[PDB]
Amino acid sequence: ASAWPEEKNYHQPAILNSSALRQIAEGTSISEMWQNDLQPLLIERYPGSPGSYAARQHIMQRIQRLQADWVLEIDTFLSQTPYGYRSFSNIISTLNPTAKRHLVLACHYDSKYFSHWNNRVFVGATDSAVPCAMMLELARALDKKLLSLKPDLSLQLIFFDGEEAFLHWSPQDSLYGSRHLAAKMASTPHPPGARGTSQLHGMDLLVLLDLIGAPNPTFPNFFPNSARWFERLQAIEHELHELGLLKDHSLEGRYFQNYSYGGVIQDDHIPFLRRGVPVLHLIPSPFPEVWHTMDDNEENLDESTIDNLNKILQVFVLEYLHL
Amino acid sequence: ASAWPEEKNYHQPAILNSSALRQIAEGTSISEMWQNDLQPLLIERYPGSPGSYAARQHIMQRIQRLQADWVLEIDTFLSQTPYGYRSFSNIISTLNPTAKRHLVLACHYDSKYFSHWNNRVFVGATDSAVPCAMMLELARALDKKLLSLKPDLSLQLIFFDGEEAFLHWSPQDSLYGSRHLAAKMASTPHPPGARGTSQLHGMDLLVLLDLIGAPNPTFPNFFPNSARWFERLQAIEHELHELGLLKDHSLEGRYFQNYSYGGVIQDDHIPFLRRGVPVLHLIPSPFPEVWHTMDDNEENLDESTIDNLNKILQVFVLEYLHL
Amino acid sequence: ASAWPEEKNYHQPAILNSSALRQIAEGTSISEMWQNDLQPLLIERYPGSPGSYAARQHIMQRIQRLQADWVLEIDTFLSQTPYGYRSFSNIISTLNPTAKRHLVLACHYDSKYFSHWNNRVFVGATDSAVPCAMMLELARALDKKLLSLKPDLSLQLIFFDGEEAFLHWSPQDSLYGSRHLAAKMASTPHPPGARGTSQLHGMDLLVLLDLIGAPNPTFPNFFPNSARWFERLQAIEHELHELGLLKDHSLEGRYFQNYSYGGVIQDDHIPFLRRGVPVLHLIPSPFPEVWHTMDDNEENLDESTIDNLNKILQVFVLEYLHL
Amino acid sequence: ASAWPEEKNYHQPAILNSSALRQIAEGTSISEMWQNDLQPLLIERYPGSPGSYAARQHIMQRIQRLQADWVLEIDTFLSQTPYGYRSFSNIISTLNPTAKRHLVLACHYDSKYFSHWNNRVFVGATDSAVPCAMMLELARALDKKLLSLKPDLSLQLIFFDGEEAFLHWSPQDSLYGSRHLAAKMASTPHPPGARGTSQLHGMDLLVLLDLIGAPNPTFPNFFPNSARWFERLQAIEHELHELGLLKDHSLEGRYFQNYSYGGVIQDDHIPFLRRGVPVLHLIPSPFPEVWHTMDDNEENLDESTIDNLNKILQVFVLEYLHL
Amino acid sequence: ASAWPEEKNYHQPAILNSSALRQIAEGTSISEMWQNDLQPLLIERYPGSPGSYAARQHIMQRIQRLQADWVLEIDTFLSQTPYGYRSFSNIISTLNPTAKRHLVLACHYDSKYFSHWNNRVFVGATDSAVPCAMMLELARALDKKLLSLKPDLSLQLIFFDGEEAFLHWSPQDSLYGSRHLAAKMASTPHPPGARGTSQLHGMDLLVLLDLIGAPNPTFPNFFPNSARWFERLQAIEHELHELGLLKDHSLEGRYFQNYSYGGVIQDDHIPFLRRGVPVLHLIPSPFPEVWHTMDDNEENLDESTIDNLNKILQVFVLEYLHL
Amino acid sequence: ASAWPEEKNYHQPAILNSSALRQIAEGTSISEMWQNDLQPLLIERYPGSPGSYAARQHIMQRIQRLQADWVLEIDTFLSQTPYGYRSFSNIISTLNPTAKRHLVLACHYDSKYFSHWNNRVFVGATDSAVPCAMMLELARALDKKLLSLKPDLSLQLIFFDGEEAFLHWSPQDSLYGSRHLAAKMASTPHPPGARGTSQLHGMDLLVLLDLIGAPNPTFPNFFPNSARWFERLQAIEHELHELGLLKDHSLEGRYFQNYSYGGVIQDDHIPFLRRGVPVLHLIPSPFPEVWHTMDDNEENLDESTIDNLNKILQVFVLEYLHL
Ligand SMILES: Nc1no[n+]([O-])c1C(=O)NCCc1c[nH]cn1
Ligand SMILES: Nc1no[n+]([O-])c1C(=O)NCCc1c[nH]cn1
Ligand SMILES: Nc1no[n+]([O-])c1C(=O)NCCc1c[nH]cn1
Ligand SMILES: Nc1no[n+]([O-])c1C(=O)NCCc1c[nH]cn1
Ligand SMILES: Nc1no[n+]([O-])c1C(=O)NCCc1c[nH]cn1
Ligand SMILES: Nc1no[n+]([O-])c1C(=O)NCCc1c[nH]cn1
Ligand SMILES: [Zn+2]
Ligand SMILES: [Zn+2]
Ligand SMILES: [Zn+2]
Ligand SMILES: [Zn+2]
Ligand SMILES: [Zn+2]
Ligand SMILES: [Zn+2]
C-alpha cells in the first residue's frame, strides 16, 4: 500500500502556550461573527428554497473576502426524497487541495422544513446556523495563520445540504448531502493518479459541529478512534479557563465531560464513519431545549458560550495543523 | 400537504391543579384493578394458546362494560415464525375513530412461551400483564371524563399480540403484532378519503408500557422527539408527591430521572418509530430482577408502585387530552 | 396441516361438449361488451385521477346489475411512489367468499400516466381496458350459470390499481395494487378462524389478463405449475375452431402455441407467484405494436379476436368450475 | 415536470433514401478502420495495465483528429474488487454537451484478465475491441455530417472500463465502469440548473455494442421499450441488401431476425436499464464461438460482416439524428 | 495467484473412437440399473423421513461394493424451513480427494413432500430417482476404467438433499442441501494448505442431472461458459446414433438440440453458478408431463431413453477424464 | 422440542466458600502465565503471517501438556477481505465434546495489522494476547479440578482468528473467524443425530474476553439475558477482596460496577448474539488508553489486575461448572 495514509494514526498536536492562547482569544470577535457571519443565515433555508441560494451565496462571499487560497466548489447534485427527486448543493471550501491529508470541519447549512405556524418560521439557529458561522469566524480569525500553507496536511470546510429530513427521520429521508459526498469521495483517486487511496484516506479527522448555540451544553465522547482528540478539547477548555480567557464559564459546568456515550446518533458523520473515517462529533447530549421548535431562534442563543467554543475550536485547529 | 398532521408538534397540555389531582388519585382503586383487571390475566397466554383467547375475551369484556363509546376491533392476522405460519390477534380499542388525531397507549398481551419447569408456568406479570391492567384501570377511572368525547383528538388503546419471541430474540422472531399493525396503519387513508395522510399521521404519540410492576423502577428518557412529554411525567410525579398522593414514594427514588439513554431497546415501538411516530417508551432500565424467569409472578409485584404509576399516567392522559 | 389447500394440484375440468360450446358462443355479444362494458373505460384513468373514480364506479355498477351474489370490496390503500405517498383502490368482486377455494381472474384498471402530446391522451385500450371489459362480459354471459353457487370452489375478480409505473419501470415503481393485495391476502386467515391457511391457499389459480385487443396475438406458456391449464386453452381454442364458432380465425394463426418462454415478464402476478400461487399469464409475446403509445386506442382493436378470446375464456371458466 | 424529457418516446427517424444510402456506404473504409482504429487496440488492456493507458490514449487521439467539437472527459474513479480497491477510467466523448438529449453509443474498452497460457495473451477482439473501432470509424465517416451540430439532440460515445470480471462473473465483480457512471449521471442536474431532470433523462436510447466481429451473428430483439428501433435496423439491413451495398450477405442469414429473447444478459446496460433508460442491446445470441478463449483474435474476425454492420449502424445514427 | 485453477478453461477431451464407443455401450445394463440401482429408490424420501435414511444407505452400499477408492462423506447439517429447523444429509462420493481438480456429477435424492392422495404416494421417479441411478450405474459400468486413478483431475458425485421445497417454491424454501455445500466448499482451503484457492476452484464443471426418465426429452444449452461441453454431448449422441448403439432413437428427435435458453431455471446449480462454477444443466425443457404429480412413477419411465442417456453420459465422462 | 436445551435458563452456581477461594487464589501464578503463556504471544500475528502459525502452535502446545482430555480442533477456513480471499484458522479446545452443554470462554488471537512505524510493531498485548494467556492459565490452574469431567455440561475454549479489520472497521471487514464459526455451529446437529438442536443450543453462555491488561478497568453490564452472571462477578470480586486475596485492589475501584450500557460494541459475540446465545462481554468501557497504538505492549500491562481478574474468572468457572 501507500506509505502516507497512515500518517494520521500517529499525528500529534503542537500544543500552544499561554502567550499563544491569549492571542487566539484576542483574535475572535463574537460580535463580528454575530452580525457579519450569522445574522444573514437566520432565514428559512430548506433545500431548493430561495434561502438555500441566499445562504450558499453568503457563505462563499464571506470566504472569498479572505486572503488564504480558499478553493470553493459547489457540488449541486440530485437525489430521491419523499416528494420526488430534488436538487441539493453541498458547499466545499478547501485549502491546498493538491495536498494529501486534510483536517475537515463540517456542519449542515440546510434548515429543516416546517409549515409556517402562528406566522412563525423555522430558521434553525442552533440547528445549524451557529455552526455555520462558527466555521466562518474560524476561517477569518485564523486567516493570517492559515496563509502559511502556500507535513503535507491542510484544512477543509464542508457545509452539507439536506441534512434534515423532509418528512420523518429515517435512513432513507436524511443525510442527502452527506451520503452523496461520502460516496463520491470514496471513489475519487487521491492524490490524483493514485490507484488505491481514495479521498477519505486524506480525511484525517472529521470534526462535525451540530446543535450548538444553547447554554450549558455537554458534549459526550462518542468514539474511541478519536477520544485522544476529545481530550485535547477538555484540556484546551481547562487551560483557557484558568487563564481567564473564557466568559461566564465554570469548571463545574465544563462543556467536555469525560462521559462516554454507548448509543448512537444519526448525522452527517455516518456516511463517513461506516467507511472508517475518524470522527469527533461535536453535538451535545442532551439536545437544546428548543430543538426542532420555532423557539430555536437568535433570542435564545447564548453569546458567551458560542464565544467560548469558538475560542476552543480555533485553538484545536491551530494545534492540529501546527500553526 | 394537509394542514392538521402537524397539530402534534405544537400540542401542549392542560396542566391539572391540586383539586384536580386529588380527585384523579381518589378515583383509582389499585385493589379493584388487581382483582377485576389483572388477576384474570395471570395465565399462560402465548399466541394460539387457549389463554390468548381467554385474555382477548377478558380485555374486551372489561372494556364493553364501560360507558364511553369504545369501538373494539380484533385484528386476527397471520405471519411467519420459526415453527411455521401462525395466527395472531391484536386487540384495538378506540374512542372517536372518525377523528384524525389519537393519543395511543399500548402494551403487549401475549406472554413469552416457556416449557413448564418444576411444574411452574410463565405468566409474565410485569411482562406484561400489569401494563394490560394499568390500561384497563385507566379506561375505567376516567370513563366519565372520557364520555365528554361524543381540538379533534382522542384516545386509542392497543394490546399487541406476539411481542415475544418464540425461540430467541431476533428481528425476524419478535414484534409479530406490531410489525403488522404498523404497516397496515401506514397504508390506510386517514381520514377516510385522504390521499396523503396515513393512520400514523393521526398517531400523536405512542406511550408504550412494558415490564412494569416491580419495585423501584427507573425509567430513562429515550428519545428527544418526546422528551418534553417525559418531563411532564417527572413534574406530574413530583407534584403528586408533594401533595401526599403517593404511597411509599421517595423523591430520592423517583421513577422518572433525567437520565438519558443513548443505546436502543427492541420493542413494539420500533415499527412505529422507524416510520417517525413519536414515542414515550415506559420500560425501565434496568429490567425487573425477575425478567424472563418463573419468578415474574403476582407475589413479586409491588402494589404501591403500580398504584403510583397508575395515578401518574391517568393525569398525563387527562392532561394530554385536555380533560 | 389442513386437508383442503391441496385440492387444486389434483383439480380437473369438466370438459364441455359441442352442444355446450355452441351455447357459450351464442351467449356472448362482442357488440354488447364493446358499448356497455368497454367504451366507458377508454378514458384517462391513472391513480388518483377523476377517471380512476369513474372507472371504479363503472365497474361496480356493471357488476351490481347482475343477479349472482357478487360481493364487492373496494380496497383503498396508500403506498409510496416517486412523487410521494398516494392513494390507490383495488376493486375486488367475489362470489361465495365464505368458500375456501377460488379461481381468480384479474387485470389492471389503471392506465399509465402520460403527459398529453399533440392534444392526445393515453387511454390504454389493450393495456388494459379490454381485459377489464372481457372480465365484465364474462360475468354477464355466465350470470345464470354462475347463480348455481348459492367441491367448495368459486370465482373471484380482481381489478388491480397502480399496475403501471409513474416514471420508469422498476421494482419500486410498479405493481402498487398487487404488491399490496398479495401481502394482505398472505396474512389473512382463510377460512376465518384457520391458523395456518392464508388467503392465497384459496387462490387456486391466478388467470391474469393483460395487453389484449390487438390482432394476431401469440400467448406463450410461461410456467409449468400451470401448463396443463394452458393446454386446455389450446384444446378449447381448437375445438371452438373446428366447430365454426370462431371468426376470422386460423389454426395456422392460433393464439395458444406450445412455445415456451424461459425469461420473465414483470406484472401483477409476481407478488402472487413468488409466494407460490399458480399462474396462467395471458399476456402476449410480443406485445402489441401500439404498446405504450397514443396509438393504443379503440380504432386499433380487432373485434374478432377479442370475441374469440372471450368465448375461449368463458369456456375455460365453466370448465374449471364444473358448470 | 419538465416538458422535454418525454421528447424521445415520440421521436421518429428521417429515413434515408437510396442516394443517401449509397453515399454512407461509400464513406466507410473497413480497411482504414482495421489499420488505423482497431489494430492498435488488439493488446492486453485489463484495468490498470499499461494497455489500458495505451488504449485510452489511442481512443482520444483518434477522436481529437476529427473536426467536430468532440468534448472528451476521462472519468477516472475507484471501486472495490476482489483483489482490493482499484482505479478505472471510463472514456466519454460528447458532442453538444450543453444540449438536453443525446443518443448514446457505447462499448467497453477493457479486456478480460487472463493469465498467459502457452505464451498466448487475451486481446479480446470481439469482446470488445471491434466495437471500439466501429464507434471510432462511425465518428470519422460521419465527421462532416456531424459538424452540422454547432430538435435539441446530439450524440455521445461512452467507452466503459471494467466491464469484465476479474475473477468470476457476479453482480459484485462486473460492470465497474457502468455501475459507476449510471449513478453519477442519475445524480447530475441536466440541463445544468434543473431540479428534477437527471442526466439519464437526456439519454434518449443506449445502443450498446458487444461481442461483434465474428461471422454469421444473430442479434435478438431484447426489450419492447426499444423494439421499434430494432425494426429500423432490420429495415436498414434489408434495403442495404437489395441495393447491393453489402458484402457476402444473405437475407437467409440476416443479422437482425425478429426472434425475441425472454431471458436476460448481464452487461453495461443494466445500470442504465433498471433506471429506465431505453436500450438497444447489440450483442449476439449465441456468442461468438471464440468467446473468452485465446482464439478471440484478429485472425478470426470477418471483415465483411464488420463492414456490413458498420454501414448499417452509421445509417441508423444519421437516421436517428436527422442528418 | 496459483497456476492450476485455470487448468479447466483450456481442458479438452480425449475423443473416443468407434471401438471404444462400442465397448462403453456394451458395458451398461439398463436392466441391471433398473433393478439393482433404481427400484430401491422409488420410495417416499422427503428430508427426515425414514426413506431418506433408506435411500442414503442404499446409495452408499451400492458404491462401497465397487472397487475404485470411492471416499464417501455424509454431510448431515441443519437449516431453516417453514416448519422450523430440520436435519438434511447430502451424500458425497469422491475419488482422489487429495487431487485439485474434479469433474462433478450431481442430482438430488430427496423427493418432494406431498400429502397422500387417493392412497397414492409421490416417489419422484424422474425427479429425481432416475438421475440417482444413472450416476450409480455410471460408477459401476466404469469401475474398472476408474481404477486407473490410484493431469491431476478426478471425479466426484454429489447427491444433494433438500432440493425440493416443503411448501411453495421460493429462494428461501429450496436448495437446502446445495446452498449449504456451496458455501462450505467456497470456504475450504483446496488443496489443503492453500491460501486463496477454495474447493470450487477444483470444481471443473458441474454436470447436474434432473427430471430425466421421460420419453422424448429436449435439453437446451443453457450457459455459454459450458456450451463447448454441450456440443460434445450432441456429437456423442450423433456418433452413437450412426453406429447403431442407441435404441428407439431418431436424429429428428435428438435429445441435445442447439436451441438456446435465455431465461432461468432454479435448481441445485445456482449456489454454484452465482459463485462462477461452470455448469452443464441436464434438465429438460419442457419438463416431463408427469412433473410433480403422482403419475411420476416407474410405469411412465422409458427404458430406451434412460439407456441412451446413460451411454452418452458415460462416454462424456471418460472423454472428460481421458480414460 | 428437546427437553435439555433449556437447562441453562435455570442453571445456578455452586458458590464456593472461603476455604475454596483461598485455594483457587493460591493456585494461579501470574508469574508463570506471564513467562510461559503470554510472552510467546507478544509477536506480530495478523492472519496468514508466520506469527499466526507461531501463536496457533504455542496455544495447542501449552494445552496438550495438560492432563484433562482437551480435544483440539483447528478450523482453517477461507473468507473474503478487502485484499481478496484469505486463510484463517480458529482454534477450538473442548472438554467432553460428546456432551450437550458447554460453558464457553473466548478471545481472539489475531493481532490487528499495522505497517511498521518508527521500527515499531503492533503486538496487541491487551488486544488480545493477555486474554489468550488468561484462558491458558485458567486451563492450567484448574487442570486437576477439570479432570473430574471424564449435569451434562462442560467447558470449551475458542480463540478466534481474524477479529480485527484489515483496513477499517466495518461489518464486512471484521469478525472473520466468528462470523464463520457461528454459522457452522448453527448448522451442526447437536448432539450428533439430533434434528432440531444446533450446536449453539449447547452454548450455555459465551464469556468473551477482550482488551484486558490495563490498569483500572471498568466492565459494564451489557445484556440482561446474562446480568445475573455479571452479578456473580461482582460478588466474586467483593468476597475475594474482603479476604485479602487481591492485590492493589480497592472497592472504590472495583472492576465490575453496576453501570449499564445502552449502546453497542461490535466484537466476536455478535454472530452468536443475534442468534440468541447468552453473552457476558468482558471488554472494558472505556478501552485502554493504549488501544490500537504501538504503546499497547508488555511494559504497559499491570500485573496486579491481570492477576486479580485471573483469580475472579477461575472462580466463576468452577462456580458455573460445580467444581
Ligand atoms: N432522534 C430523532 N428524531 O428525529 N430526528 O431528526 C432525530 C435525530 O436524532 N436527528 C439527528 C440530530 C440532528 C437533528 N437536527 C440536526 N441534527
Ligand atoms: N436483550 C434481550 N434479550 O432477549 N430479549 O427479549 C431481549 C430484549 O431486549 N427484549 C425487549 C424487552 C422486552 C422483553 N419482554 C418484554 N419486553
Ligand atoms: N419491459 C418494460 N419496460 O417498461 N415496461 O413497463 C416494461 C414491462 O415489461 N411492463 C410489463 C408489461 C405491461 C406493461 N403494461 C402492462 N403490462
Ligand atoms: N454467462 C456468463 N458467464 O460468464 N460471463 O461473463 C457471462 C456473461 O454473460 N457475460 C456477459 C456478456 C459479455 C462477456 N464479455 C462481454 N460481454
Ligand atoms: N417453476 C416452478 N414452480 O415450482 N417449482 O418447483 C418450479 C421449478 O422451477 N423447480 C425447479 C426444477 C425442479 C423441480 N423439481 C426438480 N427440479
Ligand atoms: N469503534 C471502533 N473503531 O474501530 N474499531 O475497531 C472499533 C471497535 O469498536 N472495535 C471493537 C472492539 C475491539 C477492538 N479490538 C478488539 N476489540
Ligand atoms: Zn435538526
Ligand atoms: Zn418479555
Ligand atoms: Zn402498460
Ligand atoms: Zn467478455
Ligand atoms: Zn421436483
Ligand atoms: Zn483491536
mmCIF file with all atom_site columns, N, CA, C and O and ligand atoms in Angstrom, chain B residues 108 112 127-128 163-165 168-169 210-211 265-267 283 287 291-292, chain F residues 223-225, ligand 2:
data_model
loop_
_atom_site.group_PDB
_atom_site.id
_atom_site.type_symbol
_atom_site.label_atom_id
_atom_site.label_alt_id
_atom_site.label_comp_id
_atom_site.label_asym_id
_atom_site.label_entity_id
_atom_site.label_seq_id
_atom_site.pdbx_PDB_ins_code
_atom_site.Cartn_x
_atom_site.Cartn_y
_atom_site.Cartn_z
_atom_site.occupancy
_atom_site.B_iso_or_equiv
_atom_site.pdbx_formal_charge
_atom_site.auth_seq_id
_atom_site.auth_comp_id
_atom_site.auth_asym_id
_atom_site.auth_atom_id
_atom_site.pdbx_PDB_model_num
ATOM   1   N N  . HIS B 1 108 ? -48.218 -5.193  25.339 1.00 0.00 ? 108 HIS B N  1
ATOM   2   C CA . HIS B 1 108 ? -48.464 -6.479  24.704 1.00 0.00 ? 108 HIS B CA 1
ATOM   3   C C  . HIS B 1 108 ? -49.150 -7.440  25.654 1.00 0.00 ? 108 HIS B C  1
ATOM   4   O O  . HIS B 1 108 ? -48.821 -7.508  26.831 1.00 0.00 ? 108 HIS B O  1
ATOM   5   N N  . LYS B 1 112 ? -44.470 -14.637 26.901 1.00 0.00 ? 112 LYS B N  1
ATOM   6   C CA . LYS B 1 112 ? -43.428 -15.446 26.301 1.00 0.00 ? 112 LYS B CA 1
ATOM   7   C C  . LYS B 1 112 ? -43.724 -16.910 26.502 1.00 0.00 ? 112 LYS B C  1
ATOM   8   O O  . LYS B 1 112 ? -44.294 -17.305 27.511 1.00 0.00 ? 112 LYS B O  1
ATOM   9   N N  . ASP B 1 127 ? -44.368 -8.509  32.506 1.00 0.00 ? 127 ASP B N  1
ATOM   10  C CA . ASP B 1 127 ? -44.080 -8.624  31.095 1.00 0.00 ? 127 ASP B CA 1
ATOM   11  C C  . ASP B 1 127 ? -45.100 -9.460  30.410 1.00 0.00 ? 127 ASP B C  1
ATOM   12  O O  . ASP B 1 127 ? -44.802 -10.572 30.063 1.00 0.00 ? 127 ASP B O  1
ATOM   13  N N  . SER B 1 128 ? -46.324 -8.961  30.239 1.00 0.00 ? 128 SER B N  1
ATOM   14  C CA . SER B 1 128 ? -46.737 -7.595  30.529 1.00 0.00 ? 128 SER B CA 1
ATOM   15  C C  . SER B 1 128 ? -48.185 -7.522  30.979 1.00 0.00 ? 128 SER B C  1
ATOM   16  O O  . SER B 1 128 ? -48.943 -6.701  30.509 1.00 0.00 ? 128 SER B O  1
ATOM   17  N N  . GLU B 1 163 ? -45.631 -10.077 20.956 1.00 0.00 ? 163 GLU B N  1
ATOM   18  C CA . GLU B 1 163 ? -44.450 -9.266  21.169 1.00 0.00 ? 163 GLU B CA 1
ATOM   19  C C  . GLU B 1 163 ? -43.254 -10.154 21.309 1.00 0.00 ? 163 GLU B C  1
ATOM   20  O O  . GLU B 1 163 ? -42.200 -9.874  20.753 1.00 0.00 ? 163 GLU B O  1
ATOM   21  N N  . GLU B 1 164 ? -43.424 -11.200 22.046 1.00 0.00 ? 164 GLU B N  1
ATOM   22  C CA . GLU B 1 164 ? -42.330 -12.063 22.365 1.00 0.00 ? 164 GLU B CA 1
ATOM   23  C C  . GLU B 1 164 ? -41.864 -13.005 21.355 1.00 0.00 ? 164 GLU B C  1
ATOM   24  O O  . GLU B 1 164 ? -42.573 -13.382 20.488 1.00 0.00 ? 164 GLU B O  1
ATOM   25  N N  . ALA B 1 165 ? -40.626 -13.399 21.495 1.00 0.00 ? 165 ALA B N  1
ATOM   26  C CA . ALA B 1 165 ? -40.083 -14.351 20.570 1.00 0.00 ? 165 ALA B CA 1
ATOM   27  C C  . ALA B 1 165 ? -40.508 -15.760 20.914 1.00 0.00 ? 165 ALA B C  1
ATOM   28  O O  . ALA B 1 165 ? -40.682 -16.108 22.077 1.00 0.00 ? 165 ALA B O  1
ATOM   29  N N  . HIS B 1 168 ? -35.652 -17.258 20.085 1.00 0.00 ? 168 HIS B N  1
ATOM   30  C CA . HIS B 1 168 ? -34.581 -16.412 20.562 1.00 0.00 ? 168 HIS B CA 1
ATOM   31  C C  . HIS B 1 168 ? -34.704 -15.052 19.911 1.00 0.00 ? 168 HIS B C  1
ATOM   32  O O  . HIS B 1 168 ? -34.996 -14.940 18.721 1.00 0.00 ? 168 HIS B O  1
ATOM   33  N N  . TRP B 1 169 ? -34.477 -14.026 20.711 1.00 0.00 ? 169 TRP B N  1
ATOM   34  C CA . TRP B 1 169 ? -34.783 -12.674 20.299 1.00 0.00 ? 169 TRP B CA 1
ATOM   35  C C  . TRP B 1 169 ? -34.049 -12.361 19.014 1.00 0.00 ? 169 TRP B C  1
ATOM   36  O O  . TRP B 1 169 ? -32.840 -12.545 18.915 1.00 0.00 ? 169 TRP B O  1
ATOM   37  N N  . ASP B 1 210 ? -44.280 -1.344  29.383 1.00 0.00 ? 210 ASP B N  1
ATOM   38  C CA . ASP B 1 210 ? -43.726 -2.690  29.328 1.00 0.00 ? 210 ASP B CA 1
ATOM   39  C C  . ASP B 1 210 ? -42.813 -2.949  30.527 1.00 0.00 ? 210 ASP B C  1
ATOM   40  O O  . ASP B 1 210 ? -42.002 -2.104  30.883 1.00 0.00 ? 210 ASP B O  1
ATOM   41  N N  . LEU B 1 211 ? -42.958 -4.121  31.144 1.00 0.00 ? 211 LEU B N  1
ATOM   42  C CA . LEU B 1 211 ? -42.122 -4.570  32.254 1.00 0.00 ? 211 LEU B CA 1
ATOM   43  C C  . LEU B 1 211 ? -42.318 -3.705  33.474 1.00 0.00 ? 211 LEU B C  1
ATOM   44  O O  . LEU B 1 211 ? -41.360 -3.249  34.080 1.00 0.00 ? 211 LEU B O  1
ATOM   45  N N  . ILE B 1 265 ? -33.394 -0.275  22.635 1.00 0.00 ? 265 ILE B N  1
ATOM   46  C CA . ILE B 1 265 ? -34.130 -1.412  23.158 1.00 0.00 ? 265 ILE B CA 1
ATOM   47  C C  . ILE B 1 265 ? -35.158 -1.771  22.115 1.00 0.00 ? 265 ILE B C  1
ATOM   48  O O  . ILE B 1 265 ? -35.875 -0.890  21.635 1.00 0.00 ? 265 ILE B O  1
ATOM   49  N N  . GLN B 1 266 ? -35.240 -3.049  21.776 1.00 0.00 ? 266 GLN B N  1
ATOM   50  C CA . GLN B 1 266 ? -36.194 -3.509  20.777 1.00 0.00 ? 266 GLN B CA 1
ATOM   51  C C  . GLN B 1 266 ? -37.535 -3.790  21.444 1.00 0.00 ? 266 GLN B C  1
ATOM   52  O O  . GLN B 1 266 ? -37.589 -4.300  22.559 1.00 0.00 ? 266 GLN B O  1
ATOM   53  N N  . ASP B 1 267 ? -38.620 -3.398  20.799 1.00 0.00 ? 267 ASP B N  1
ATOM   54  C CA . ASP B 1 267 ? -39.933 -3.477  21.432 1.00 0.00 ? 267 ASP B CA 1
ATOM   55  C C  . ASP B 1 267 ? -40.961 -2.941  20.439 1.00 0.00 ? 267 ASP B C  1
ATOM   56  O O  . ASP B 1 267 ? -40.613 -2.367  19.408 1.00 0.00 ? 267 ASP B O  1
ATOM   57  N N  . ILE B 1 283 ? -40.585 1.684   29.637 1.00 0.00 ? 283 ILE B N  1
ATOM   58  C CA . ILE B 1 283 ? -39.990 0.418   30.027 1.00 0.00 ? 283 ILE B CA 1
ATOM   59  C C  . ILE B 1 283 ? -38.825 0.802   30.917 1.00 0.00 ? 283 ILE B C  1
ATOM   60  O O  . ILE B 1 283 ? -38.140 1.778   30.613 1.00 0.00 ? 283 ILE B O  1
ATOM   61  N N  . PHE B 1 287 ? -34.148 -3.763  33.769 1.00 0.00 ? 287 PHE B N  1
ATOM   62  C CA . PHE B 1 287 ? -35.342 -4.551  33.769 1.00 0.00 ? 287 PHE B CA 1
ATOM   63  C C  . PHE B 1 287 ? -35.557 -5.170  35.133 1.00 0.00 ? 287 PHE B C  1
ATOM   64  O O  . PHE B 1 287 ? -34.637 -5.267  35.934 1.00 0.00 ? 287 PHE B O  1
ATOM   65  N N  . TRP B 1 291 ? -37.043 -10.705 35.420 1.00 0.00 ? 291 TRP B N  1
ATOM   66  C CA . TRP B 1 291 ? -37.286 -10.709 33.996 1.00 0.00 ? 291 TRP B CA 1
ATOM   67  C C  . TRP B 1 291 ? -37.056 -12.078 33.406 1.00 0.00 ? 291 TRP B C  1
ATOM   68  O O  . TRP B 1 291 ? -35.973 -12.641 33.529 1.00 0.00 ? 291 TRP B O  1
ATOM   69  N N  . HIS B 1 292 ? -38.045 -12.567 32.702 1.00 0.00 ? 292 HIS B N  1
ATOM   70  C CA . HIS B 1 292 ? -37.960 -13.808 31.998 1.00 0.00 ? 292 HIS B CA 1
ATOM   71  C C  . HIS B 1 292 ? -37.552 -15.007 32.790 1.00 0.00 ? 292 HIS B C  1
ATOM   72  O O  . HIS B 1 292 ? -36.858 -15.865 32.324 1.00 0.00 ? 292 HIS B O  1
ATOM   73  N N  . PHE F 1 223 ? -25.838 -6.987  28.790 1.00 0.00 ? 223 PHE F N  1
ATOM   74  C CA . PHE F 1 223 ? -27.084 -7.595  28.373 1.00 0.00 ? 223 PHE F CA 1
ATOM   75  C C  . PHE F 1 223 ? -27.839 -8.179  29.556 1.00 0.00 ? 223 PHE F C  1
ATOM   76  O O  . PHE F 1 223 ? -27.262 -8.887  30.382 1.00 0.00 ? 223 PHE F O  1
ATOM   77  N N  . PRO F 1 224 ? -29.143 -7.962  29.623 1.00 0.00 ? 224 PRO F N  1
ATOM   78  C CA . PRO F 1 224 ? -29.922 -8.604  30.678 1.00 0.00 ? 224 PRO F CA 1
ATOM   79  C C  . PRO F 1 224 ? -30.017 -10.112 30.571 1.00 0.00 ? 224 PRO F C  1
ATOM   80  O O  . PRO F 1 224 ? -30.207 -10.769 31.593 1.00 0.00 ? 224 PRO F O  1
ATOM   81  N N  . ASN F 1 225 ? -29.937 -10.703 29.386 1.00 0.00 ? 225 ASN F N  1
ATOM   82  C CA . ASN F 1 225 ? -30.023 -12.159 29.331 1.00 0.00 ? 225 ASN F CA 1
ATOM   83  C C  . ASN F 1 225 ? -28.884 -12.821 30.108 1.00 0.00 ? 225 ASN F C  1
ATOM   84  O O  . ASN F 1 225 ? -28.904 -14.041 30.298 1.00 0.00 ? 225 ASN F O  1
HETATM 85  N N1 . LIG G 2 .   ? -31.969 -8.079  25.234 1.00 0.00 ? 2   LIG G N1 1
HETATM 86  C C1 . LIG G 2 .   ? -32.869 -9.187  25.065 1.00 0.00 ? 2   LIG G C1 1
HETATM 87  N N2 . LIG G 2 .   ? -32.585 -10.460 25.033 1.00 0.00 ? 2   LIG G N2 1
HETATM 88  O O1 . LIG G 2 .   ? -33.739 -11.122 24.861 1.00 0.00 ? 2   LIG G O1 1
HETATM 89  N N3 . LIG G 2 .   ? -34.715 -10.219 24.789 1.00 0.00 ? 2   LIG G N3 1
HETATM 90  O O2 . LIG G 2 .   ? -36.058 -10.460 24.629 1.00 0.00 ? 2   LIG G O2 1
HETATM 91  C C2 . LIG G 2 .   ? -34.203 -9.057  24.921 1.00 0.00 ? 2   LIG G C2 1
HETATM 92  C C3 . LIG G 2 .   ? -34.931 -7.769  24.883 1.00 0.00 ? 2   LIG G C3 1
HETATM 93  O O3 . LIG G 2 .   ? -34.309 -6.791  24.893 1.00 0.00 ? 2   LIG G O3 1
HETATM 94  N N4 . LIG G 2 .   ? -36.350 -7.764  24.804 1.00 0.00 ? 2   LIG G N4 1
HETATM 95  C C4 . LIG G 2 .   ? -37.017 -6.492  24.728 1.00 0.00 ? 2   LIG G C4 1
HETATM 96  C C5 . LIG G 2 .   ? -37.712 -6.071  26.002 1.00 0.00 ? 2   LIG G C5 1
HETATM 97  C C6 . LIG G 2 .   ? -38.850 -6.939  26.451 1.00 0.00 ? 2   LIG G C6 1
HETATM 98  C C7 . LIG G 2 .   ? -38.829 -8.246  26.770 1.00 0.00 ? 2   LIG G C7 1
HETATM 99  N N5 . LIG G 2 .   ? -40.020 -8.656  27.157 1.00 0.00 ? 2   LIG G N5 1
HETATM 100 C C8 . LIG G 2 .   ? -40.759 -7.571  27.020 1.00 0.00 ? 2   LIG G C8 1
HETATM 101 N N6 . LIG G 2 .   ? -40.054 -6.569  26.623 1.00 0.00 ? 2   LIG G N6 1
#
